[PDB]
């Protein structure tokens, strides 16, 4: 956590349907955006902090 890894996602298409439809996630909270709208949105970049 103190050294949380960061990855960049750019120049690609991601199908988020499999993401929020998965039951393996205990907590799934979106702020400023809806999980379903992701498939219908385009973003300049995405930062994944794990």
């Amino acid at each position: 956590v103190y050294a949380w890894n960061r990855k960049r996602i750019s120049n690609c298409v991601a199908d988020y349907s499999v993401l929020y439809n998965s039951a393996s996630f205990s907590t799934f909270k979106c702020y400023g955006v809806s999980p379903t709208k992701l498939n219908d949105l385009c973003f300049t970049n995405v930062y994944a902090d794990s």
Binding site: G32, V33, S34, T36, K37, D40, L41
Partner: protein
């Protein structure tokens, strides 16, 4: 000499400009454009903004 007229005109335009520029203010909302909020946030969340 025509200022009395020109002045008036400017004021009118000025107001409109201000009014139009008020379209680009957040007023505390996440964004100043309704379309972005509608496309991103669900109605339960979007309605407050």
């Amino acid at each position: 000499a025509l200022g009395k007229l020109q002045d008036v005109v400017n004021q009118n335009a000025q107001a409109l400009n201000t009014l139009v520029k008020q379209l680009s203010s957040n007023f505390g909302a996440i964004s100043s454009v309704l379309n972005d909020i509608l496309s991103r946030l669900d109605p339960p969340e979007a309605e407050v903004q």
